[PDB]
Design an enzyme around this catalytic site. Structure first.
Site, PDB file in Angstrom:
ATOM      1  N   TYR B  61      47.858  38.520  35.115  1.00 32.87           N
ATOM      2  CA  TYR B  61      47.056  39.685  35.477  1.00 32.87           C
ATOM      3  C   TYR B  61      47.330  40.855  34.543  1.00 32.87           C
ATOM      4  CZ  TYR B  61      44.687  38.744  39.969  1.00 32.87           C
ATOM      5  OH  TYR B  61      43.842  38.311  40.957  1.00 32.87           O
ATOM      6  N   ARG B  71      40.466  47.082  24.381  1.00 36.67           N
ATOM      7  CA  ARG B  71      39.025  47.225  24.199  1.00 36.67           C
ATOM      8  C   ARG B  71      38.510  48.508  24.836  1.00 36.67           C
ATOM      9  NH1 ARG B  71      33.854  44.125  26.899  1.00 36.67           N
ATOM     10  NH2 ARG B  71      32.340  45.334  25.683  1.00 36.67           N
ATOM     11  N   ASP B  75      36.802  51.829  22.315  1.00 35.29           N
ATOM     12  CA  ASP B  75      35.510  52.489  22.392  1.00 35.29           C
ATOM     13  C   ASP B  75      35.609  53.908  22.930  1.00 35.29           C
ATOM     14  OD1 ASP B  75      36.158  51.696  24.945  1.00 35.29           O
ATOM     15  OD2 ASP B  75      34.241  50.748  25.396  1.00 35.29           O
ATOM     16  N   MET B  79      33.879  57.551  21.224  1.00 37.31           N
ATOM     17  CA  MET B  79      33.228  58.705  21.835  1.00 37.31           C
ATOM     18  C   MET B  79      33.855  60.005  21.359  1.00 37.31           C
ATOM     19  SD  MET B  79      33.139  57.153  25.659  1.00 37.31           S
ATOM     20  CE  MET B  79      31.758  58.227  25.936  1.00 37.31           C
ATOM     21  N   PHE B 103      30.206  54.477  27.406  1.00 35.56           N
ATOM     22  CA  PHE B 103      30.904  55.036  28.565  1.00 35.56           C
ATOM     23  C   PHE B 103      30.694  54.197  29.813  1.00 35.56           C
ATOM     24  CE2 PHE B 103      27.086  57.790  27.943  1.00 35.56           C
ATOM     25  CZ  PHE B 103      26.359  57.487  29.075  1.00 35.56           C
ATOM     26  N   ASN B 124      51.668  41.238  42.559  1.00 34.94           N
ATOM     27  CA  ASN B 124      51.818  39.787  42.596  1.00 34.94           C
ATOM     28  C   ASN B 124      53.232  39.364  42.226  1.00 34.94           C
ATOM     29  OD1 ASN B 124      50.094  37.143  42.750  1.00 34.94           O
ATOM     30  ND2 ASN B 124      48.612  38.815  42.592  1.00 34.94           N
ATOM     31  N   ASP B 135      56.700  32.484  48.220  1.00 29.94           N
ATOM     32  CA  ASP B 135      55.412  32.580  47.549  1.00 29.94           C
ATOM     33  C   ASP B 135      54.534  33.533  48.348  1.00 29.94           C
ATOM     34  OD1 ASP B 135      53.279  32.036  45.726  1.00 29.94           O
ATOM     35  OD2 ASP B 135      54.047  30.001  45.466  1.00 29.94           O
ATOM     36  N   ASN B 142      45.420  32.719  45.655  1.00 34.50           N
ATOM     37  CA  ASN B 142      45.923  33.656  44.660  1.00 34.50           C
ATOM     38  C   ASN B 142      45.546  33.220  43.250  1.00 34.50           C
ATOM     39  OD1 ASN B 142      47.259  35.970  43.849  1.00 34.50           O
ATOM     40  ND2 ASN B 142      49.267  34.982  43.782  1.00 34.50           N
ATOM     41  N   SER B 145      41.832  33.922  42.892  1.00 33.46           N
ATOM     42  CA  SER B 145      41.554  35.347  42.761  1.00 33.46           C
ATOM     43  C   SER B 145      41.765  35.842  41.338  1.00 33.46           C
ATOM     44  CB  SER B 145      42.431  36.136  43.725  1.00 33.46           C
ATOM     45  OG  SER B 145      42.139  35.797  45.065  1.00 33.46           O
ATOM     46  N   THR B 149      38.645  37.337  38.356  1.00 31.76           N
ATOM     47  CA  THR B 149      38.763  38.513  37.502  1.00 31.76           C
ATOM     48  C   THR B 149      38.497  38.157  36.044  1.00 31.76           C
ATOM     49  OG1 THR B 149      40.461  39.221  39.066  1.00 31.76           O
ATOM     50  CG2 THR B 149      40.204  40.529  37.074  1.00 31.76           C
ATOM     51  N   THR B 201      39.071  40.118  44.073  1.00 32.54           N
ATOM     52  CA  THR B 201      40.038  41.089  44.566  1.00 32.54           C
ATOM     53  C   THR B 201      39.984  41.245  46.077  1.00 32.54           C
ATOM     54  OG1 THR B 201      40.476  43.465  44.670  1.00 32.54           O
ATOM     55  CG2 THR B 201      38.375  42.760  43.803  1.00 32.54           C
ATOM     56  N   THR B 204      42.325  38.849  47.177  1.00 35.87           N
ATOM     57  CA  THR B 204      43.667  39.344  46.885  1.00 35.87           C
ATOM     58  C   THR B 204      44.173  40.250  48.000  1.00 35.87           C
ATOM     59  OG1 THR B 204      43.081  39.273  44.538  1.00 35.87           O
ATOM     60  CG2 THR B 204      45.083  40.447  45.135  1.00 35.87           C
ATOM     61  N   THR B 211      50.724  38.150  53.716  1.00 34.94           N
ATOM     62  CA  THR B 211      52.055  37.894  53.165  1.00 34.94           C
ATOM     63  C   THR B 211      53.072  38.928  53.633  1.00 34.94           C
ATOM     64  OG1 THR B 211      50.847  37.134  51.218  1.00 34.94           O
ATOM     65  CG2 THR B 211      53.240  37.244  51.056  1.00 34.94           C
ATOM     66  N   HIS B 284      35.697  56.195  46.645  1.00 35.67           N
ATOM     67  CA  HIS B 284      36.972  56.885  46.794  1.00 35.67           C
ATOM     68  C   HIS B 284      38.113  55.998  47.305  1.00 35.67           C
ATOM     69  CE1 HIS B 284      39.608  60.390  46.908  1.00 35.67           C
ATOM     70  NE2 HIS B 284      40.150  59.778  47.946  1.00 35.67           N
ATOM     71  N   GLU B 286      38.609  53.052  46.380  1.00 31.21           N
ATOM     72  CA  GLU B 286      39.000  52.362  45.154  1.00 31.21           C
ATOM     73  C   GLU B 286      40.043  53.154  44.369  1.00 31.21           C
ATOM     74  OE1 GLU B 286      38.677  49.552  43.482  1.00 31.21           O
ATOM     75  OE2 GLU B 286      39.544  50.365  41.648  1.00 31.21           O
ATOM     76  N   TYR B 288      42.147  55.268  45.645  1.00 31.70           N
ATOM     77  CA  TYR B 288      43.388  55.223  46.397  1.00 31.70           C
ATOM     78  C   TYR B 288      43.977  53.821  46.447  1.00 31.70           C
ATOM     79  CZ  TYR B 288      42.528  60.029  47.758  1.00 31.70           C
ATOM     80  OH  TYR B 288      42.374  61.391  47.731  1.00 31.70           O
ATOM     81  N   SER B 299      58.794  55.168  43.705  1.00 37.97           N
ATOM     82  CA  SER B 299      59.811  55.347  44.729  1.00 37.97           C
ATOM     83  C   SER B 299      60.987  54.400  44.540  1.00 37.97           C
ATOM     84  CB  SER B 299      59.189  55.162  46.108  1.00 37.97           C
ATOM     85  OG  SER B 299      58.138  56.083  46.323  1.00 37.97           O
ATOM     86  N   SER B 315      59.164  59.763  56.405  1.00 37.13           N
ATOM     87  CA  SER B 315      58.112  60.659  55.944  1.00 37.13           C
ATOM     88  C   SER B 315      57.301  60.031  54.818  1.00 37.13           C
ATOM     89  CB  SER B 315      58.719  61.984  55.496  1.00 37.13           C
ATOM     90  OG  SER B 315      59.518  62.540  56.522  1.00 37.13           O
ATOM     91  N   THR B 359      50.107  63.581  50.046  1.00 34.12           N
ATOM     92  CA  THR B 359      50.467  63.395  48.647  1.00 34.12           C
ATOM     93  C   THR B 359      51.568  64.362  48.235  1.00 34.12           C
ATOM     94  OG1 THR B 359      48.114  62.930  48.380  1.00 34.12           O
ATOM     95  CG2 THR B 359      49.470  62.944  46.409  1.00 34.12           C
ATOM     96  N   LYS B 362      54.963  63.090  49.495  1.00 38.04           N
ATOM     97  CA  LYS B 362      55.519  62.057  48.626  1.00 38.04           C
ATOM     98  C   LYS B 362      56.165  62.651  47.381  1.00 38.04           C
ATOM     99  CE  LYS B 362      52.468  58.269  49.901  1.00 38.04           C
ATOM    100  NZ  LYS B 362      53.665  57.440  50.195  1.00 38.04           N
ATOM    101  N   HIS B 419      39.850  65.928  35.027  1.00 39.50           N
ATOM    102  CA  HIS B 419      40.554  65.773  36.296  1.00 39.50           C
ATOM    103  C   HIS B 419      40.986  64.336  36.525  1.00 39.50           C
ATOM    104  CE1 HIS B 419      41.301  64.928  40.459  1.00 39.50           C
ATOM    105  NE2 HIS B 419      40.143  64.306  40.574  1.00 39.50           N
ATOM    106  N   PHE B 420      40.067  63.385  36.380  1.00 37.27           N
ATOM    107  CA  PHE B 420      40.432  62.054  36.826  1.00 37.27           C
ATOM    108  C   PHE B 420      41.160  61.260  35.762  1.00 37.27           C
ATOM    109  CE2 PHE B 420      35.961  61.306  35.450  1.00 37.27           C
ATOM    110  CZ  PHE B 420      36.092  60.193  34.654  1.00 37.27           C
ATOM    111  N   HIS B 421      41.066  61.659  34.499  1.00 31.84           N
ATOM    112  CA  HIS B 421      41.994  61.116  33.525  1.00 31.84           C
ATOM    113  C   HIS B 421      43.385  61.703  33.695  1.00 31.84           C
ATOM    114  CE1 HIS B 421      38.159  60.052  31.489  1.00 31.84           C
ATOM    115  NE2 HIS B 421      38.859  58.993  31.129  1.00 31.84           N
TER     116      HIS B 421
END
Ligand code: HEO
Ligand code: UQ8
Ligand code: 3PE
Ligand code: 3PE
Ligand code: 3PE
Ligand code: 3PE
Ligand code: 3PE
Ligand code: HEM
Ligand code: CU
Lengths: 184, 659, 259, 97
Positions: B61, B71, B75, B79, B103, B124, B135, B142, B145, B149, B201, B204, B211, B284, B286, B288, B299, B315, B359, B362, B419-421
């Site tokens: 994986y 890849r 690309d 950009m 993109f 995994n 296992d 498994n 799965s 992908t 997935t 998965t 498990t 959203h 996805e 998380y 952790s 906590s 968040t 944590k 933001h999301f990068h």
């Protein structure tokens, strides 16, 4: 071992129930999206739906009698009870094919009036699950006839017992939201 | 042959595509030539490709994720090169037909085939080891799965060569992705890459949910589990409950393009706002799914390299459970500007900032984990410190975007892009590189090079900040996303700094390749002998490095949290049993590869409307499923002579190294 | 600092800048101590630092875990009172309390240009609008095609444009000038050229001269056949003026998808 | 024993299907009472099928196999009511006001 796969299939049916709720939410948004075409009252024949409801209900108790015969050592009675719920499930599929064929011929297919898109994608997705369980039931029937009520075969009966009774649970939500609310 | 394939689908008279087509064909034929030169075809089969082992599947994986990271970055460097040229008045390379699939491909590859397999691959490898399991719960599932992908990465890569990819963005919004505005095969490549990988997935998430609940060691309760297992448990819940939404939503788009239905069209009663509601109801959870096991990775690392117990376990556990429930009620913040009222926008704006509270719990629990420890500055610890600085910046940025009034001027901006990068490169990519460095001795038996791993950190850190803090400034200036040609010259010299920061990220990817090459070149010197190269606390480090393919001759008896640390403190920690028993293990299966091989044939035939090949491809999957059900040679028993050979060759390395 | 969001020229943009600044200031009381403790604890509690205290078995503190839960809760509580008041104040389709006779402009997205209708003046333009400064502007936005987003960044909020649908946006300009407007939702190959100029005139005398200039053009938009001639796909369109428009043309664009 | 639970859940589900079908096919002199009784009997017949046929229990997988069902009911209710409330406000707006 047996209970691990049965519990794992129950988790899959919970994800499969979320799959059907997206179709129910899409249907509720698009139920008034009739593009000048037929509505629910112009399409839904409720005596036809009532026979389809009882055919899935007759196959639900018939699988329960197959599971009862699995808890004794009667291999022959499991096969005969599995043969009756296959016939009731094939009757349910054949009436849904007859319902869909009448709409497509009469110009009320999924490509017109996007309420009809949501109707074909919710009833059709449920019918694809019954067809998928009808293939699984035929594969399980030939495995019991060849290998008996082995430990692997008894787990597969209980996995399909979860699947087959779930499709009658979904259909209760189908004829309520689609047919009975539509035909008011 | 039939359908829409016509040899004009191959992009001839287009030199940028044809060079990269030849670079993959000749780069792939050279890879094929090395296996037949060394005679490893019967070794890759029966040990790796058909493997039901979670350790082998976990490595593969990550191998797919690292290759697709090359890849998806190469690309993204195009950009940055185009936007630096398009500003200051040059219409250079990358026309809008070329640029708009970039993109879309970069968004799809980096989410589904980089971040998802790296997160799943770390789960995994590690989760059956941390709970004392031998296992995963469903080992053939498994293996199946993983290959679903691979079908996803095949279909995106053949869209480079056979046809085209979508030009709609990575989520394929309606009518632009409809059949009357995208009549080509690009959205069909987008549809069947996501459908066939998305069912992989989903299996998965079911596999690791059962498990963790059922395959745990005796004595390990839920609140004695490792925190990475707790984070993997909550991430798999979001997989089960949200990837069905992606399955229906893409299938409703499939019926629009193939059967002419009206779900998200403009004309005949369809509602195009319903897809955007549905694609973000999956969308959203996805993100998380990506960030939750990364929280579990950091952790374990912060507890290991501070040499201190993890602060606030209860906590930290309940913050993870709070995130996995609040992730499903916040999804309207991605379309604040659609036109819903003030009541709807404020409700989802308020509850989006509520999920920032667990968040922050944590973050400060990791800070007080290292509050009075002895911090060893490993490479994996450097990614942990760099995560806390980086994720606090981009996480704070998203809460600013959670205010609808602030989002009315920042929606679809480069502020959003930055933001999301900030929370993926800072969160997920830093977490994936930290867990790769941390569990490399357990996966392979030797340690990665420490010198080249730190240099990879220093290029991925503020090299990211040169790349994306200008996009924070450009989002205020008014530059929107997906801009290709004739960009304003005021946006130049800020796009030039962002292109320079993408070069620094390229050196950190190059430092990862040098780190992997030097470590393999010098694996005999940096060999992990005892199985615990650091001071480890969880049950993974109680095994040898690599684990003995059954992971445990005797399953451990857990009494407390950090079970291997308590064993080392109590003094036993390495006890040879007087006798061993046989171990029930699953067998490797060639099916799953065959089911996936029929599915990529089925997917390719659906894209090009080769309907006879789609029936053959679909019936091949069903028949291989049915004929696998008749197989009874699924399991076998490991003999005690095989176990005693493996255990005695571990316990003399324990004898040599002091313990 | 002078970059169209930190320096806005409209009342909606000025209210949104204070909303960004107050939110960013409020989140800085927890993020700055998080970053400073990340570098500070790493430096002070090194393994090579022999003077720092070492407490390996310390993992529970009721007083510490109270603060870790309270301070993010109190900040988000203050960040939810506003985000309720400002969401109801900065919402589009809520008219501005100004009482100066708002000017209604009808906006149609095309491939790939912006079509503007002035129904009170009988004027249609392409990729250029004008309005007086310190007068409210009521925008009725729709699409003839795939989804776009009407955005003038220096004046305030954006809103989506969808086919068969009518989104509403209210804006105002406090200073005269010309502000570049864009499409903020990707719409195809010509998306990079969907740029228009929004001119705020100093008074309504200069606005009436621009309207009188636009009705000297020989081109008209009196029928939907002239509309679909304009709605043929094109990129990087110049500014064009139409002198006579159909009186209910905006309803006709919506009704070609809803009927 | 277990035959009794399959038979009682079959008798109940026959009654819980005939009455909602008969009320639409007759008219019952009230539209709102029909919609209430149809949705009430739909929830009751679902609960009959979970107990009598699917054999749902609080002690089946050490507390699980029931909390997983309760969790997904809440996710479905979040997804369905949330999307309907969003799409109602999106469709009440975007109209020619
Ligand atoms: C895995 C990646 C990831 C992560 C972790 C997040 C986490 C968050 N997301 Fe970012 N999202 C992610 C992936 C995306 N979100 C997006 C878009 C997006 C938008 C849309 C804005 C727009 O449309 O213009 C909003 C409002 C947010 C909000 C948030 C919030 C509030 C968090 C929070 O969870 C962050 C919480 C963390 C914080 C707050 C810092 C830690 C806390 C500290 C240090 C102390 C506590 C402080 C406080 C409580 C204030 N997400 C998009 C856009 C997709 C597209 O446009 O195509 C993607 C990919
Ligand atoms: C818009 O069309 C295009 C793309 O989107 C489809 C591209 O991704 C790209 C690719 C961008 C890059 C420069 C990458 C080129 C080289 C790299 C690093 C790819 C390496 C990947 C592999 C060898 C694995 C592919 C193997 C298969 C399963 C087949 C181009 C050129 C393109 O024109
Ligand atoms: C667009 C339509 C796509 C449809 C694709 C799938 C349906 C096609 C037909 C499939 C049915 C036959 C499958 C094989 C039957 C026999 C398998 C078997 O033994 O089942 C028992 C199995 C327990 O497993 P075990 O006993 O260990 O044996 C493993 C078998 N390899 O128990 C199991 O867990 C395996 C059986 C589970 C079956 C899952 C049910 C499939 C539901 C498909 C949804 C259909 C519609 C979806 C539409 C798309 C989304 C909108
Ligand atoms: C997923 C979301 C979308 C839903 C629609 C499409 C998918 C339908 C099929 C889903 C099947 C889910 C079943 C999961 C059950 C898991 C728990 C369980 O009972 O496990 C049984 C078994 C596990 O196997 P294991 O224990 O490893 O040992 C196997 C021995 N033979 O499990 C098995 O080995 C049997 C199940 C694996 C085989 C399934 C692979 C075929 C799926 C093809 C789908 C085709 C759809 C194409 C169209 C896409 C949509 C348009
Ligand atoms: C999943 C299982 C899917 C299996 C079904 C795939 C094969 C379908 C049979 C096709 C039979 C046929 O002749 O259909 C042709 C028909 C029109 O095609 P034709 O006029 O020949 O020209 C080609 C492109 N328009 O073509 C059509 O009208 C489209 C036929 C395929 C429809 C796509 C099915 C949707 C699958 C995903 C569900 C979501
Ligand atoms: C926490 C989880 C960890 C992360 C998961 C893994 C992700 C990265 C994947 C790379 C790691 C795989 C290789 C390491 C395995 C150990 C190498 C080894 O055992 O050596 C085998 C081989 C030569 O050794 P031989 O003589 O055959 O056997 C003697 C063994 N003592 O040694 C060799 O020279 C062959 C090694 C095989 C390498 C093939 C793997 C491909 C990976 C591609 C990723 C991208 C590569 C970028 C470009 C590289 C090419 C320039
Ligand atoms: C259909 C067209 C498209 C095809 C798409 C691609 C399909 C998906 C491919 C995914 C699977 C990747 C293959 C995984 C092999 C990894 C081997 C490896 O890392 O170990 C080599 C082995 C290490 O030694 P040992 O320590 O015994 O290993 C156990 C460690 N726990 O060292 C040894 O002792 C033996 C050395 C021999 C191994 C050489 C194999 C080279 C690696 C294969 C290519 C990987 C890189 C390219 C992947 C492309 C993915 C898209
Ligand atoms: C490592 C360096 C990376 C760089 C330099 C980079 C660069 C870019 C650029 C330039 C864009 C387009 C911005 C625009 O539209 O104006 C983009 C979009 C995007 N990136 Fe990345 N990226 C990187 C890594 C990643 C990673 C690791 C992910 C993982 C999820 C990711 C996910 C996305 C997505 C989802 C989009 C939006 C796709 C779309 O617009 O259709 N990126 N990135
Ligand atoms: Cu989000």
């Amino acid at each position: 071992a047996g209970g691990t796969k049965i519990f794992g299939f129950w988790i899959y049916l919970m994800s499969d129930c979320i799959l059907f709720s997206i179709l129910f939410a899409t249907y509720a948004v698009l139920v008034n999206g009739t593009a000048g075409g037929p509505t629910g009252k112009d399409i839904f024949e409720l005596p036809f739906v009532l026979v389809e409801t009882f055919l899935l209900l007759f196959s639900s108790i018939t699988y329960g009698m197959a599971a009862i015969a699995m808890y004794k050592n009667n291999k022959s009675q499991v096969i005969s009870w599995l043969a009756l719920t296959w016939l009731f499930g094939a009757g349910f599929i054949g009436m849904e094919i007859y319902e869909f064929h009448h709409l497509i011929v009469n110009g009320m297919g999924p490509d017109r009036s996007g309420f009809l898109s949501a109707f074909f994608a919710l009833v059709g997705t449920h019918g694809l699950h019954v067809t998928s369980g009808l293939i699984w039931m035929a594969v399980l029937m030939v495995q019991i006839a060849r290998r008996g009520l082995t430990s692997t075969n008894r787990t597969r009966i209980m996995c399909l017992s979860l699947f087959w009774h779930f499709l009658d649970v979904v259909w209760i939500c189908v004829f309520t939201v689609v047919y009975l609310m539509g035909a008011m | 042959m039939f359908g829409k394939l016509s040899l004009d689908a191959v992009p001839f008279h287009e030199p940028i595509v044809m060079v990269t087509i030849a670079g993959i064909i000749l780069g792939g034929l050279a890879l094929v030539g090395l296996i037949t030169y060394f005679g490893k075809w019967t070794y890759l089969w029966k040990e790796w490709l058909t493997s039901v082992d979670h350790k082998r599947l976990g490595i593969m994986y990550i191998i797919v994720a690292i290759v697709m990271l090359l890849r998806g970055f190469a690309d993204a460097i195009m950009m940055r090169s185009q936007q630096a040229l398009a500003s200051a008045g040059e219409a250079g390379f990358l026309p809008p037909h070329h640029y708009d699939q970039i993109f879309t491909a970069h968004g799809v590859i980096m989410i589904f085939f980089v971040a998802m397999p790296f997160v799943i691959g770390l789960m995994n490898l590690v989760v059956p080891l941390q709970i004392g399991a031998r296992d995963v719960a469903f080992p053939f599932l498994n293996n199946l799965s993983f290959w679903f992908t691979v079908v996803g990465v095949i279909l995106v890569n053949v869209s480079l060569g056979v046809g085209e990819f979508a030009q709609t963005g990575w989520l394929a919004y309606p009518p632009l992705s409809g059949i009357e505005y995208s009549p080509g095969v690009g959205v069909d490549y987008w549809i069947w890459s996501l459908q066939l990988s998305g069912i992989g997935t989903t299996l998965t998430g079911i596999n690791f949910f059962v498990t963790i609940l059922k395959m745990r060691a005796p004595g390990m309760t839920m609140f004695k589990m490792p925190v990475f297992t707790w984070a993997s448990l909550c991430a798999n819940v979001l997989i089960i409950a949200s990837f069905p939404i992606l399955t229906v939503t893409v299938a409703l788009l499939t019926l629009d393009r193939y059967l002419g239905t009206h779900f998200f069209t403009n004309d005949m009663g369809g509602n195009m706002m319903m897809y955007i509601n549905l694609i973000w109801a999956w969308g959203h959870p996805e993100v998380y799914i990506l960030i939750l096991p990364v929280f579990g990775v950091f952790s374990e690392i912060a507890a290991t390299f501070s040499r201190k117990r993890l602060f606030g376990y209860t906590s930290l556990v309940w913050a993870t459970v709070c995130i996995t429930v609040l992730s499903f009620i916040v999804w309207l913040h991605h379309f604040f500007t659609m036109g819903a009222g003030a009541n709807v926008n404020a409700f989802f704006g308020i509850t989006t900032m509520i999920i920032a509270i667990p968040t922050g719990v944590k973050i400060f629990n990791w800070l007080f984990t290292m509050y009075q420890g002895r911090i060893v500055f490993h490479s994996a610890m450097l990614w942990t410190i760099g995560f806390i600085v980086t994720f606090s910046v981009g996480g704070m940025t998203g809460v600013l975007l959670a205010v609808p009034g602030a989002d009315f001027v920042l929606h679809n901006s480069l502020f959003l892009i930055a933001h999301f990068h900030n929370v993926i490169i800072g969160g997920v990519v830093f977490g994936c590189f930290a867990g790769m460095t941390y569990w490399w001795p357990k996966a392979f038996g030797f340690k990665l090079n420490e010198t080249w791993g730190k240099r990879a950190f220093w290029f991925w850190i503020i090299g990211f900040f040169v790349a994306f803090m200008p996009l924070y400034a450009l989002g205020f200036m008014g530059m929107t996303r997906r801009l290709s040609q004739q960009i304003d010259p005021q946006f130049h010299t800020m796009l030039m700094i962002a292109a320079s920061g993408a070069v620094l990220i390229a050196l950190g990817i190059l430092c990862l390749v040098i780190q992997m090459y030097v470590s393999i070149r010098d694996r005999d010197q940096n060999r992990d002998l005892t199985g615990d190269p650091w001071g480890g606390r969880t049950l993974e480090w109680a095994t040898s490095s690599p684990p003995p393919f059954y992971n445990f001759a005797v399953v451990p008896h857990v009494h407390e949290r950090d079970a291997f640390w308590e064993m080392k403190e109590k003094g036993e920690a390495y006890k040879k049993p007087d006798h061993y028993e046989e171990i029930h293990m699953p067998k490797n299966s060639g099916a799953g590869i065959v089911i996936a091989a029929f599915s990529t044939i089925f997917g390719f035939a659906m894209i090009w409307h080769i309907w006879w090949l789609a029936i053959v491809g679909f019936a091949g999957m069903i028949i291989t499923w049915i004929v696998k059900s008749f197989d009874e040679d699924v399991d076998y028993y490991v003999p005690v002579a095989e176990i005693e050979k493996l255990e005695n060759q571990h316990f003399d390395e324990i004898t040599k190294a002091g313990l | 600092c002078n970059s169209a969001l930190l320096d806005p020229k409209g009342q909606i943009g000025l209210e949104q800048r204070s909303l960004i600044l107050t939110a960013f200031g409020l989140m800085l009381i927890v993020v700055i101590p998080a970053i400073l403790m990340a570098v500070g604890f790493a430096w002070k509690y090194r393994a090579s630092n022999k003077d720092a205290k070492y407490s390996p078995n310390w993992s529970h503190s009721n007083k510490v875990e109270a603060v870790v839960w309270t301070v993010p809760i109190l900040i988000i509580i203050f960040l939810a009172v506003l985000t309720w008041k400002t969401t109801h104040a900065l919402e589009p389709s809520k008219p501005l309390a100004h009482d100066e006779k708002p000017i209604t402009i009808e906006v149609v997205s095309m491939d790939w240009k912006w079509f503007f209708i002035y129904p009170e003046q009988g004027i249609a333009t392409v990729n250029e609008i004008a309005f007086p400064a310190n007068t409210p502007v009521y925008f009725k936005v729709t699409s003839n095609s795939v989804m776009n987003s009407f955005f003038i960044p220096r004046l305030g909020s954006q809103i989506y444009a969808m086919a068969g649908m009518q989104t509403r946006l209210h804006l105002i300009a406090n200073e005269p000038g010309t502000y570049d407007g864009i499409s903020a939702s990707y719409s195809g190959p010509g998306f990079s050229g969907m740029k228009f100029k929004a001119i705020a005139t100093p008074d309504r005398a200069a606005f009436d001269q621009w309207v009188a200039k636009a009705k000297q053009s020989p081109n008209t938009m009196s029928d939907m056949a002239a509309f679909e001639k304009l709605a043929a796909p094109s990129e990087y369109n110049q500014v064009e003026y139409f002198s006579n428009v159909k009186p209910d043309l905006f309803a006709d664009v919506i009704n070609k998808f809803m009927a | 024993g277990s035959v009794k639970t399959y038979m009682t859940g079959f008798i109940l589900s026959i009654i819980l299907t005939v009455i909602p079908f008969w009320m639409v096919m007759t008219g019952a002199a009230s539209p709102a009472v029909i919609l209430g009784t149809i949705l009430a009997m739909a929830v009751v017949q679902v609960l009959v099928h979970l107990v009598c046929f699917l054999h749902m229990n609080t002690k089946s997988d050490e507390g699980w196999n029931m909390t997983a069902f309760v969790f997904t009911v809440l996710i479905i209710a979040i997804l369905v009511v949330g999307s309907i409330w969003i799409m109602w406000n999106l469709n009440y707006n975007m109209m020619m006001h």
